[PDB]
Structures are given as structure tokens and as C-alpha cells.
Write a protein that binds this ligand. Structure first.
Ligand SMILES: *[C@@H]1O[C@H](CO)[C@@H](O[C@@H]2O[C@H](CO)[C@@H](O[C@@H]3O[C@H](CO)[C@@H](O)[C@H](O)[C@@H]3O)[C@H](O)[C@H]2NC(C)=O)[C@H](O)[C@H]1NC(C)=O
Ligand SMILES: *[C@@H]1O[C@H](CO)[C@@H](O[C@@H]2O[C@H](CO)[C@@H](O[C@@H]3O[C@H](CO)[C@@H](O)[C@H](O)[C@@H]3O)[C@H](O)[C@H]2NC(C)=O)[C@H](O)[C@H]1NC(C)=O
Ligand SMILES: *[C@@H]1O[C@H](CO)[C@@H](O[C@@H]2O[C@H](CO)[C@@H](O[C@@H]3O[C@H](CO)[C@@H](O)[C@H](O)[C@@H]3O)[C@H](O)[C@H]2NC(C)=O)[C@H](O)[C@H]1NC(C)=O
Ligand SMILES: CC(=O)N[C@H]1[C@H]([C@H](O)[C@H](O)CO)O[C@@](OC[C@H]2O[C@@H](O)[C@H](O)[C@@H](O)[C@H]2O)(C(=O)O)C[C@@H]1O
Ligand SMILES: CC(=O)N[C@H]1[C@H]([C@H](O)[C@H](O)CO)O[C@@](OC[C@H]2O[C@@H](O)[C@H](O)[C@@H](O)[C@H]2O)(C(=O)O)C[C@@H]1O
Ligand SMILES: CC(=O)N[C@H]1[C@H]([C@H](O)[C@H](O)CO)O[C@@](OC[C@H]2O[C@@H](O)[C@H](O)[C@@H](O)[C@H]2O)(C(=O)O)C[C@@H]1O
Ligand SMILES: *[C@@H]1O[C@H](CO)[C@@H](O)[C@H](O)[C@H]1NC(C)=O
Ligand SMILES: *[C@@H]1O[C@H](CO)[C@@H](O)[C@H](O)[C@H]1NC(C)=O
Ligand SMILES: *[C@@H]1O[C@H](CO)[C@@H](O)[C@H](O)[C@H]1NC(C)=O
Ligand SMILES: *[C@@H]1O[C@H](CO)[C@@H](O)[C@H](O)[C@H]1NC(C)=O
Ligand SMILES: *[C@@H]1O[C@H](CO)[C@@H](O)[C@H](O)[C@H]1NC(C)=O
Ligand SMILES: *[C@@H]1O[C@H](CO)[C@@H](O)[C@H](O)[C@H]1NC(C)=O
Lengths: 162, 325, 325, 162, 325, 162
């Protein structure tokens, strides 16, 4: 991925996080757990759902082949009909196959960007108050209880305290 | 005390291709192409298809005697012609503008058979001996097309000028057929129509027709060295047809009130079974039951089908790269 | 003391769609599609279109007597035929290869009418009684096509063999017309052309024509049970035409020197007004005045038009997402 | 946006900045003001102008429908002409509508990237000498007069001083 | 002590275009379009093309006497017809369905010439005086088509009814030709075929043909005011042909066993040299020797060619932006 | 470029680095030298090779023009054949030319992203132990011999030492 997060500085995914695409793993005195980030997950779902439906809608016409027949003295127009039908078959196959390859590349990139920005959102909140380990994890220098954790996740972490 | 940022992984083995990379496992994806068919014909708009069975299109619509099962009124959502149909044009000859006829019929929905010219239309001639062993029915060894009547001279008298007229007063166009006989030699010609230069002339407000017999011995087909030139046309609402002939006329007897479809219409050449089921999408090689956007089954269909495409797969990534640990 | 980095916002409410998101307000954008027409016909390359008014293409070019307004030389950038034109083929009959004729004329730019065969070409026959009540002019109740001449026998003598010749010595192809009369019965035939087997034969270096009268009573149209088979052809520069006939000939009288266009040419069937204005882009449903790249008005046009497309809108973002505060 | 700047860590735009797409807001003893960054604005205008013209040029051909007529015995070729004309109408509609959706997404991304890089250019210049507030704003630790401001904007800020 | 991160630069001056930027120098790129041709014709599948030289398609296949170089069996990968070929239809007339004939021949691979109807087939008529000065050979001033035989009356006797038959027992379709003579007047008609109404009738299992002479004086071409209507057809394996005529028949003499190609087939009209070389891709304007994906040379080709495109260049960046210092 | 590295904060390329697309320049007591980063170079080569081949494969059909002839009474179908052949010529020209412009833009972006991520990989490794000069160069605060250099390049730099 071009943004460097997925299968990058965050080496792998979490099978333990089941309720969304992007999120957090926290660890403190009360223990450990996974939690989806719902804002960025929902925004991604809406975007990709919109992309899938737009593709489905733009592809919502059909070229109609007919098997009208042609006599042996209509070789020219019979072949004209064949080359034209094959003609549209080839451009629509090209369009569909090329669109899917192009959209797949950009879809994976989008997810990669989203993990990266989520990581940045948290880095920007903690600043001094935590150590960036380089793998998506931050070690706090102060104690962070459950409400401290939740304030990082909902983006209201209060830096002047602690 | 620590907080980590990360992403979903799961047990998916489903893969997609990208421009930069083949065979990439992703957490979620959707397949857009259908490659599955039910190998059968079904009803469309819960109106049934017309199976020709052992008759071709020409045999059915000319009224070949061995096609009596089909004879009369028919409604259809599309037509299935079987590749090994034996009952077509029994008395050898060319049906003129055959390909345009099939296209016209394919654009249709319903035919009502009716008597256009009763045999008693044609004054001073015989209307009861126009049979042949080339055209057996299932009971007689010598019959003829139920929609045509082979007119022959009577008793001794020269075959006179006969005339017929029909003003289409209805609201539906009329599909009708006629013919011109071409005997193998000049004695068969005289035995049937007498001496003199013969003609078949027909006309409407928008159409003229005129042809003469062309006497010659053609290669034997179904035991006949003679030929018939078959013809068809469409009489529009408000038009009237005049038939004038003094020899060789294969007269129009019955004809079809024709209802033009607003949908697409199709003539499938196939040996697939017609079964008791419904469909919204019918291709020549089977029914498709899908929500999918593409299909690689057939370019040829009736109903509302997915776009045809040569691809084996069109899998779109929705989720992210699956990297479990 | 501080410095901030930021981006433009404005009062724009104009929106665009993306693959990921609908209805996104952007600071700047450009619309690429035109949906606006002037519902009228204008001049193209400041050459005017030819309004047929109350004549069809066939009536105009055959020289129907009620089309005298159009008769003679014409130049046009395209042709407008009105849907309710009444003056077409007045004496009932088929114009052969009609669709190819319209396509040929559509490819044209200018016609010069000229006298191809003066009536005094045809020796020993009458050229002054070829009129009919099916073809009234605006003054006579019985006239005929100004570009054709209906030849009839004289006094008593059998209608003889007549001949005509024209070597096209000019640089322009010649569009010309002729016909073959088909009377309703055999007495009308004799009253007009006498007895015997009649023929109309025509020929050039590259074309042969031969036809005989086909006598029969057709349904009455414009009071006529007879018919005419009309024909047309093109005499190329350097070719010469020979007419030989001994009956039933509707002779070529006047004809057209034809200038082929290098542009596209069009035959619009429309009841839209022709007005005194200029255009570079003329569609069948109106003028387009644009710089835009696409249009959803019509696929049918003459001149230089934007690409036709079914879309309602094709708005391209140029600016950024508008997020005012 | 995938780069995280527009409607992201820089929450909104500036109606007060009228002379360009990307730029600055400064504040010091001499007062306050908006100023466009002309280098990155002009570069963006040239790029998007080039994109618009290339699209306009690639779409500069037309498929020409004709209304040649067809008799009742030319149903097959009359329908051949109809299906072919409708054929090209459908692929060009698809091409135009799909291109516009795809290009819009990437155009907005480009702007987003440009704001991000502009922000990075300034962050990289100031380093220690200013406090990154996380919203695109930098609070200087030293006094920054009008020539100090202008040296940040023109990318010649002199770190060893101050 | 320091470590820097950076990227490749080189001495490349090769440029590419992007949506945002024209004329961008890149370190590596690949060109996808071919614009280079060898201006000559070569063998395809190391089978040679058939050069017509100074004969047109009609002259070659009718057996124009001045095309004896070509006469007989031929195999070809495609056909080259020269724009200034003089030896075509020597005795003036139309070859019916000419465009369909060229398409049929283009779909072929090999012809075997053979004697279909020996002159001794036609009983009671002369088969040795059917020559003309319109059709010189290279030695005689008056000859005729080697594949046809112009039949004329003998001595004094009325030209009788003649008959011919051929059952195609082979596995290959047969391409054959015939004709109907149309004299300029009625004395030439009697000098050659005697008095009476004449006919040419032909028939197979699937085809009927019937035509009469149409006597008229056409403009002189190659010194002839008469005409011939030439015809062609294909006799399928298992079919048999019957010829019956009593006047004006240009009889089928020799004919061609025809091998249909499975490849594409082409008829190039070109004056380019045929040379002794091989190719996999042959366009009408030259050979292409490439691995490239596109070409802007010609839409018209035989063999396996790159996709045709109007572009001057299709250069794809592979490397990065070249920024040397 | 949208990622800001190529012809950006890394102002120019290296003619001296001949063995790859992205890499390093080191300088210590033992001297100076260029070295390709083979992992990211190879990954880029595989990706772009795959892109080139996919384009070449999707374009691997041909529309076949024929020069069947048409008489003077076949003006309508002769023109039908012409408009259809020109029809496919125009959509395939559009497809090829548009694809090349679009893919070129994204290919250059990919390289730009790759240099950026490589730079980030190194920045993330060194942290405190080196000074980021803002132009892709890092000045170490400790001595970095040849094995220290090689540990940065192979991504195993040992921070707790030094
Ligand atoms: C983001 O997360 C933080 C932390 O979870 C949320 O702040 C928390 O808000 C609750 C009330 O909404 C605070 O509890 C209150 O305490 C008083 C007694 O001190 C009690 O009487 C109230 O009824 C209520 O229980 C809680 O202290 C506070 N946590 C902190 C400050 O660490 C915040 O609301 C979240 N914001 C969003 C937008 O989701
Ligand atoms: C980027 O912005 C800086 C700051 O605005 C520009 O530096 C400024 O350059 C001017 C002259 O070009 C300096 O003024 C000079 O001062 C002397 C007296 O000391 C006077 O005699 C000269 O005639 C002139 O007025 C000014 O001090 C200096 N500002 C500083 C150093 O803070 C710089 O030129 C800009 N660079 C670009 C590429 O735009
Ligand atoms: C990444 O680069 C580092 C530094 O070049 C590699 O570490 C080096 O590994 C070698 C052996 O693989 C170490 O040398 C060994 O030293 C002992 C004596 O102390 C000797 O007996 C062994 O036979 C061997 O020569 C070398 O010290 C070490 N360099 C260090 C620690 O700075 C590392 O293997 C590379 N990793 C990858 C994945 O490429
Ligand atoms: C109405 C009529 O004439 N029916 C005849 C029929 C026709 O006369 C004939 O088809 C016109 O050409 O002839 C029938 O048998 C003819 C007979 O001819 C032999 O040469 C041949 O070997 C036989 O197979 C058979 O065709 C016929 O069956 O059509 C009798 C019928 O009454
Ligand atoms: C040149 C000529 O013959 N003109 C006649 C015309 C023709 O003889 C006729 O069209 C050839 O078929 O006949 C005219 O009137 C004929 C008359 O016939 C009645 O049966 C019918 O009811 C009338 O409407 C009318 O057609 C004619 O008008 O054409 C007279 C003309 O002089
Ligand atoms: C078989 C035969 O009849 N060959 C004749 C030929 C034909 O009779 C003729 O083509 C049939 O129309 O006539 C030949 O010369 C005819 C002669 O006619 C003159 O009017 C003209 O000026 C000359 O150029 C020439 O055509 C011929 O050459 O075909 C003689 C041949 O024996
Ligand atoms: C790669 O893809 C092909 C088909 O696209 C598939 O048959 C093959 O199993 C895949 N290989 C791997 C390792 O997934
Ligand atoms: C029948 O046709 C004639 C035309 O000859 C027409 O005038 C008449 O009105 C028609 N009759 C009916 C009942 O429609
Ligand atoms: C969303 O778009 C549709 C048409 O695309 C428009 O009619 C509607 O008003 C839009 N809604 C909003 C909230 O902008
Ligand atoms: C007229 O036509 C004849 C052909 O019969 C030709 O030879 C002659 O040169 C032509 N005359 C002129 C003046 O063009
Ligand atoms: C820009 O491109 C055109 C053709 O695309 C070329 O002729 C011209 O030399 C180029 N200019 C520069 C400065 O590279
Ligand atoms: C020749 O044709 C006849 C048809 O008249 C056919 O019955 C016969 O079997 C054929 N003979 C051969 C040897 O094929």
C-alpha cells in the first residue's frame, strides 16, 4: 500500500477485532480489549458502498444481440452483424475487467490511508504524554484508566492534565 | 499502559486482483458476475413459450398437415424451434424473404387464425384436388398446406380468370401466404391449368405482385421435380387485397391476425426442455436467477438479464488486505 | 505569535458527485454537458435549409404539379420534410429503391433542373394528353408530373417503337426518373397503347433495365385502380442513356444535374420553424449554441456538435471541497 | 479525503482567503491577515487546467447517427442500425459518467494532498522554534515580525537565528 | 556521520504525458504503439498471396482469355488486386451479386478448376463459334471466356431445347458461372438463336433461376451494343444442377471446386510489391514486425496484428520522474 | 507529486545510484557510497511490471475492419459499415489514450509514495539518535560505522545502544 500502514509499519491485522475495519487495542490496570473506531469505519463503509452501487448503476445497460438470420447472399451484412456484436462484447469486457483492477487497487489504498490517518489522529493527541513505538502502539508515561482510554478513542484526550 | 491502532483481519481466503498485484486475499469482497444457468426454458412474464416440437417455422405457419397440433391461435413470450424438426416445407420450393419473415414473427406475441378466402371465392375452378404425396398428413398419404389451397382446372374448361378481395376492416395487421406453381414440363402444365400464358397478380394500396410460371425440371426433392415459389406479406389495417389469376395460383386460404409485441421477442433454436416454472431472465442456453450485474452465459436472451461479458470473474474488493497473525 | 496553514472556502452551493460520495459542495467546478436548445432551424455555413412545406421528397423531385413553388434549381445545407405533407406520389404507385433515393439526395447540395428529353424526342406518338385527375395542379383538375411525360398512342396507329438518347457530356452526375404504366384491365391497355406485347427497356454503360406491364385491378387510390412503377437512376459523367420502348412508358422529361456534398447532409422530418438566423450546430430538435463538450439534446444533427450522451449532468470538480465556517 | 487535511485536522476552510486555494493566516504584533501561497496554488491550477483540457480533448470525437430510412422488408438491417447507434450511445454515456466520478474523487484528493504537503513544508521549517497545535496552526516561541512571517511563506525561514 | 534517502536519476530525455502534466521526463518507460511498416506484401503462414497482376477479380474467375497466366488451380493466403487492371469483363455486361461474389472468394483458400459441362453436353447446337472481338486473347483477335461457352444455333435448324446435369458427388462446394445474352436488335437475335420466345432456366435442390432475353440497343462498350447478364452460384456437396435452355444461354463450361478458409481472408486493392519473405502480420499498406500492443498503420489486415488506433504515441511510464543534478 | 518527496523535500535524484530506483547515500569515517534498497525497489518493479502486463493483456483483442464492397444501391449499409468501423476506432483510441494518461499520473505517484515511505522507515528507526535535516538526510549524534549503516538499511537498527 502507498500509505505505508497496512502490512507496513503496522505489520498485521487483528482477528480479535470483530466489530469493524479500523480500531484500537488498549491495555491498562483494568486489563485489555479491542474496540472498533466507529466513525472512520462507518465513513469507509458508506464510501465503498457508494462506490459499489455507482459501478453497478453505470453498468446497468445491456447491448442486445439478436439472432436474426442471413441468407447465403447476405454474407456481407451477416458478417457486419457479427463483427458489431463481437465489437461491443469486447469493449464491455475491457471496461468491466479494467475497472475492477483499477478500483481494487484504489480501494485497498483507501483502507491503507484510513489506518494511517487514524494513527495520526492519536499521535497528534498524545504528543509528549506517550512514547510512539513505531508499530502503531503508544506507551503512556502517565496512568491511563478506562475514561482516559475512551477520551483518546473519541478524540477528546485532555493533554494539559496528567 | 498502552493504546494501539490497527485493522480488521479474519479467516477469509477469497482473493481479488489489482493492477499492481494478483491474488490478494481480502477481508470482504463482492462477486459481480454470474456463471450459473438452469438448463431449461421457462415462462416469461408468466406467459409460456411456443414449442414447435417437430415442426420448423415454415411448416407451422404455412400449415403443413403434420403440424396440426400447432394449427390455429397461439400466444407466446418467445419461440423455440428444435434443430431436428422434420416438418417444414414439404412440397419443394423457396419461401421468399424467409429471413425477414422469421424476424417479423419474432416481433410478435399472438396470432389468430381465420378464413381469409373461402374456397368458394374462386369461380369456375376446382378447389378439392389440390393434394400431393409430398405433403402427407398423419392419416392421408396425399394432403396439402391447411393455410393454402392448390387450385386446379375443372372437368375440361380452360382455367378462367379468378378474382378475390378482402378489405381488412379490423385493427390488427394480417399475415398471409400464397404461391406460384412451377411444373416440371409443359404437359403437367396443361393437365392442370390448360393452355395459354398464365399469371399470378396481387395488389394492395401499398404493394404490387406479379409473377408467371417458369417451366423446367428441377432435381427431385420429396419425389417432386416441380416447384412452388411461396410468398408472404402483411395486410395493414384499412388496406384491402386483390387477387387476380388465370393459372398456377396457390391461393391464400387461411391467414393470421397478428399482434405485434412491445417487448423484444426471440426465436431460440435449441433442444433444451421447456418446463413448468417462471423466470425474469431467459437466455438461449438457460435461465439466470441473479442479482448480479454481469453474466458470461450468453449474449442471446429475452427478459431482463445482466450484461454479457467474456470474463470468468469480476470480484470487487470491499474490505481490506487480509493480514492475519 | 502564530502562523496557520489553510485552504479556500467561498459561498458556492454547486455540487459534484464522486465514486465515494454524492452531493459534495465544491468551491469551483465546470459543467461539461449542454441541455439547452433553440427550437428552430437555422442556416448552416450561412447557406439556408430547403423547406419542402406541403410537399414530400417524392412529390418535390418527381415534379408533382402542386409543388411548383419548389420546381427548378435548389441549393441547400439540409432538407426539412414536414410530417403532414400531402403532395407526394399523386398517381398511385411505388417509387423503386425509395430509401436509397432519399439517402442519395441527402448526400447532395444543389440540383439544376434541365430538359433531358424534349417531348419531340419520341417519334410518332402523343405527348400532350398524358394527364389525370389523380394529379391536379392548382389550376387544372387533371395534370401530371412536370419531370415526367405520360406517352399515349395517337389517332389510330399502333403505338410504335420509340427511342431516345442522351450523352452526359458535363462534369456532374444526372439524377433522372421514369416509369412503367400498369392499367387495371386489357381494354384500358388497348385504348392507350394498342395491342401487342409491350416493353420498357433502358440502358447505359453500367446499367440495364427491362420491364413489362402487369395488367390487374388494384384497390382504388386517389380514384385509380391502375398503377405506375416509378424508377430513378444516376447517369454518371461520360455515360450515355438509351431509352427504347413500344408501350407503357412514363418517359423522362426533365432531370437534375446533381452536386454531391463533401459535408454530411441531412433530411430532417420535423415541424419546427425555419427562421432567419445562423448556426454552427443544428440538431433535428433545435440549434445548440455552446462551447460545451457533451449534449443530451439529440444524436441527430448537421454541423459541428458536441458528443451526444444520455446524462442529465456532467459536472467536473476543479476547486476543492467547500467547508466554510 | 485520504490525506487527512481538508475537513480533517484542519477542520474548515477560510472565506477570508480570497486570492487562492491554499495559504496562510499569520498573527503577530503588527496584526493579522490571510495570504495565498502562490507557488502551490498556481501549480494546482496548471495541473487541473491540464486535466480538464485533456478530458475535453479525448472526448472531441462524435459518433454520427443517421436517419436513413428502412422499408418493411429491411427490418433486420433497420434494427441492426438501431442497436449499433444505441450501442455507441451507451458506451459513451458510460465513459463520460464514469470518468467524471473517478476524476472528481481524485481531484478532491489532490487538493487534500496539497494542503497536507504545505503544512509539512512549514512544520519542517520551524521544528523546535514553534509549537504545532494539531490544527494547522503553529505558535512561535520567539517573536516573528513581518519579515519573519514572509520568510516562512517563501520557504527561507532561518532556523539558526531566534 | 550521515545517511540520506533518495531516488534514481539518469541521462534519459524520454518523456510521457499525464492527466496533470505534459512532457515529463522519466527514467524508464515503454512505448506501446507501432508506427513502422515494410511497404510490401509477404507470405502468411508461409503460404503465398495470389497476385492478379493485370486481371481484375471478374476477369480471373470468369476466365478472360488474357488471364491465362492465372487459369487453373490456385492456392492463396490472400488476394492482391491491382488498381489499374485492364482485363476484367471484356464483353460488356453486369456480373450479378458482384459484391457478394468478392466476399465469397475472399473467404476462400484454394480453387480447383475442372470441366463441369463438356461442350458435348448440349445436343443439336454449335459450341465452336462463340467468340467475339470484344474478348481477344493474346493470339486470337476474337475469343471468349475459358470458363464459359457461348452457344449458337447450327446450320439452319431452330435452336432446340438443350439440357445439362451435374450431381456434385464430392466433398467440396462448387463455384460456377453462367450467362444470358441480350442482343441489340431482333435480327441479331434470329441470326444466333432463331425465332420464338427463349428462356434460360436453372435449378438445384435449393435454388431456382429463370430469365429471358431483353432485346435493346445499349451504348457501345468495347464495340458492343449487346449485353450479357453474368451469374454465379455455389453448388453444395450432394446437390445437383439442372440446366434447361432453348436460347441465349452462355453455358457453364469449367468451374471451381472451392475450399473455404477457417482464417479470415482478405482482398487487398494495392499496387505494393509482392516479395519473397514471411510475415505474421500483413496490413493492406505493409508488413508489421512487432511485439507492440497498438499500431496506427491500418485497420485492414490479415494475420495476427496489434490493435489499430489513431494515436501518434502511447508511451507508458515505468520509471520515475527524472530529476538529475 | 502528491506525496511530496520526489522533486519535493528531496529536491533531486541521484545519477550516482545506478542499481535501483530508491536507496541510500551514507557517509562515515570509512567514506561514502550509494546503495539501492532492494526490497522496495523489487516490490515496485513487480508492481509496475504487473501493471504493464495487465494493460497489455486487456488490450489483447482487435476489432476487425473488412473491405467488403458495396454497390451504388447499397449506400445505406455501406455507410452503416463505415460509421461502425469508425465507431470502434474512436472508442479504442479514447480508451488507450485516456488509460495511458491516467496510469502515468498514478505510476509517478506510486514512486513518490515509495520514496516517502522509505524515508519514514528510516526516520522511525533513528528517532532521537539522529538529526532530520529536512531533505532526506539524517545526521547521527553517535558514530555509525559500516555495520551500523547496514543495520539502518536492512531495518534492524538497534536504538537502545549508542
Ligand atoms: C469522550 O470520553 C470522555 C471519557 O469517557 C467523556 O467524558 C466523560 O463524561 C462523563 C459524563 O458524560 C463524566 O462523568 C460525569 O461525572 C460526574 C461526577 O464527576 C457525574 O455526576 C456525571 O453524571 C457524569 O457521570 C466523566 O467524568 C467524563 N470522563 C472524563 C472527564 O474523563 C466524554 O463525554 C466523551 N466525549 C464524547 C464526545 O463522546
Ligand atoms: C524571503 O523573505 C525574506 C524576508 O522577507 C526576504 O529577505 C529580505 O530581503 C530584503 C532584500 O531582498 C532584505 O532587506 C534589505 O536590507 C538592507 C539593510 O539591512 C537594505 O539596504 C537592502 O536594500 C534591503 O532592504 C531583508 O532584510 C530580508 N529579510 C530578512 C533577512 O528577514 C527574502 O529575500 C525572501 N526570499 C525570496 C526568495 O523571496
Ligand atoms: C542487518 O545488518 C546487521 C549489521 O550489518 C547484521 O548484523 C551482523 O550480523 C553478523 C553475522 O550475521 C555479525 O557478525 C558476527 O560476529 C561474530 C563475532 O562477534 C562472528 O563470530 C560471527 O561469525 C559474525 O561475524 C555482526 O556483528 C552483526 N552486526 C552488528 C550486530 O552490528 C544483521 O544480520 C542484518 N540483518 C539482516 C536481516 O540482514
Ligand atoms: C394437384 C396435383 O396435381 N397433385 C398431384 C401431383 C401433382 O400433379 C404434381 O406434383 C405436379 O408436378 O402429382 C402427384 O404424384 C406425382 C408423381 O410424379 C412421379 O413422377 C413421381 O415419381 C412421384 O413421386 C409423384 O411425385 C403427387 O403426389 O404430387 C399426384 C397428385 O395427385
Ligand atoms: C392519359 C390518360 O389516360 N388519362 C386519363 C386517365 C387514365 O386513362 C387512367 O388513369 C388509366 O388507368 O383516366 C382519367 O379518369 C379515369 C377515371 O376512371 C374512373 O373509373 C374513376 O372512377 C375516376 O376516378 C377516374 O380515375 C383520369 O382522371 O386519370 C381521365 C384521364 O384523361
Ligand atoms: C458468336 C457471335 O455472334 N460472335 C460475333 C459477334 C456477335 O454476333 C455480337 O457480339 C452479338 O451482338 O459479333 C462480332 O462483331 C460484331 C461487330 O458489330 C459491329 O456493329 C461493331 O461495330 C463491331 O465492333 C463488332 O462488335 C464480334 O466481334 O463480337 C463478330 C463475332 O463473330
Ligand atoms: C493465483 O491466481 C490463479 C487464478 O487467478 C489461481 O488459480 C491460483 O491458485 C492463485 N495462486 C495463489 C497462490 O493464490
Ligand atoms: C373497404 O375498402 C374500401 C376501399 O376500396 C374502403 O373505401 C371502404 O370504406 C372499406 N370498408 C370498410 C367497411 O371498412
Ligand atoms: C442530492 O442530489 C440530488 C440529485 O443528485 C438532489 O436532487 C438533492 O437535492 C441532493 N441533496 C442534497 C442534500 O444536496
Ligand atoms: C458521347 O458518347 C459516345 C459514346 O457512344 C462517346 O464516344 C462520345 O465521345 C460522346 N460525345 C461527347 C461530345 O462527349
Ligand atoms: C512538448 O511536447 C510536444 C509534443 O507532445 C513536443 O513537440 C515538444 O517538443 C515538447 N516540449 C518540451 C519542452 O519538451
Ligand atoms: C446424384 O443425385 C441424385 C439426386 O437426383 C441422388 O439421389 C444420387 O444418390 C446421387 N448420386 C451419387 C453417386 O451421389
Amino acid at each position: 500500500g502507498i500509505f505505508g500502514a497496512i502490512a507496513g509499519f503496522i505489520e498485521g491485522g487483528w482477528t480479535g477485532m470483530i466489530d469493524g475495519w479500523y480500531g484500537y487495542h488498549h491495555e491498562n490496570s483494568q486489563g485489555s480489549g479491542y474496540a472498533a473506531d466507529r466513525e472512520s469505519t462507518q465513513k469507509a463503509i458508506d464510501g465503498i458502498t457508494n462506490k459499489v452501487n455507482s459501478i453497478i448503476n453505470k453498468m446497468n445497460t445491456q447491448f442486445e444481440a439478436v439472432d436474426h438470420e442471413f441468407s447465403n447472399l447476405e454474407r456481407r451484412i451477416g458478417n457486419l452483424n457479427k463483427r458489431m456484436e463481437d465489437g461491443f462484447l469486447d469493449v464491455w469486457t475491457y471496461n468491466a475487467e479494467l475497472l475492477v483492477l483499477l478500483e481494487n487497487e484504489r480501494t485497498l489504498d483507501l483502507h491503507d490511508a484510513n489506518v494511517k490517518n487514524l494513527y495520526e489522529k492519536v499521535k497528534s493527541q498524545l504528543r509528549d504524554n506517550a512514547n510512539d513505538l513505531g508499530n502503531g502502539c503508544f506507551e503512556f508515561w502517565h496512568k491511563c484508566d478506562n475514561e482516559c482510554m475512551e477520551s483518546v478513542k473519541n478524540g477528546t484526550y485532555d493533554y494539559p492534565k496528567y | 499502559d498502552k493504546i494501539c491502532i490497527g485493522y480488521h483481519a479474519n479467516n477469509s481466503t477469497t482473493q481479488v486482483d489489482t493492477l499492481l498485484e494478483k491474488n490478494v486475499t481480502v477481508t470482504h469482497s463482492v462477486e459481480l458476475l454470474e456463471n450459473q444457468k438452469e438448463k431449461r426454458f421457462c415462462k416469461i412474464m408468466n406467459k409460456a413459450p411456443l414449442d414447435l416440437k417437430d415442426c420448423t417455422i415454415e411448416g407451422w405457419i404455412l400449415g403443413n398437415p403434420k403440424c396440426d397440433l400447432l394449427l390455429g391461435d397461439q400466444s407466446w413470450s418467445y419461440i423455440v424451434e428444435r434443430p431436428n424438426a422434420q416438418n417444414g416445407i414439404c412440397y419443394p420450393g423457396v419461401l421468399n424473404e424467409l429471413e425477414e419473415l422469421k424476424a417479423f414473427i419474432g416481433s410478435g406475441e399472438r396470432v389468430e387464425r381465420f378464413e381469409m378466402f373461402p374456397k368458394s371465392t374462386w369461380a369456375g375452378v376446382d378447389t378439392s384436388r389440390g393434394v400431393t404425396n409430398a405433403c402427407p398428413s398423419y392419416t392421408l398419404d396425399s394432403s396439402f398446406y391447411r393455410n393454402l389451397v392448390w387450385l386446379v382446372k375443372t372437368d375440361s374448361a380452360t382455367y378462367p380468370v379468378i378474382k378475390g378481395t378482402y378489405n381488412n376492416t379490423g385493427t390488427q395487421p394480417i399475415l398471409y401466404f400464397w404461391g406460384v406453381h412451377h411444373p416440371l414440363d409443359t404437359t403437367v402444365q396443361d393437365n392442370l391449368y390448360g393452355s395459354g400464358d398464365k399469371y399470378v397478380r396481387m395488389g394492395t394500396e401499398s404493394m404490387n405482385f406479379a409473377k408467371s410460371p417458369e417451366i423446367a425440371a428441377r432435381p427431385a426433392v420429396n419425389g417432386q421435380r416441380s416447384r412452388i415459389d411461396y410468398y408472404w406479406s402483411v395486410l395493414r389495417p384499412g388496406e384491402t387485397l386483390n387477387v387476380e389469376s388465370n393459372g398456377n395460383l396457390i391461393a391464400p386460404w387461411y391467414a393470421y391476425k397478428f399482434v405485434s409485441t412491445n417487448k423484444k421477442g426471440a426465436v431460440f433454436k435449441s433442444d433444451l426442455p421447456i418446463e413448468n416454472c417462471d423466470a425474469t431472465c431467459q437466455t438461449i442456453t438457460g435461465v439466470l436467477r441473479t442479482n448480479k450485474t454481469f453474466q458470461n452465459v450468453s449474449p442471446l436472451w429475452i427478459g431482463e438479464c445482466p450484461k454479457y461479458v467474456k470474463s470468468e470473474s469480476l470480484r470487487l474488493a470491499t474490505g481490506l488486505r487480509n493480514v492475519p497473525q
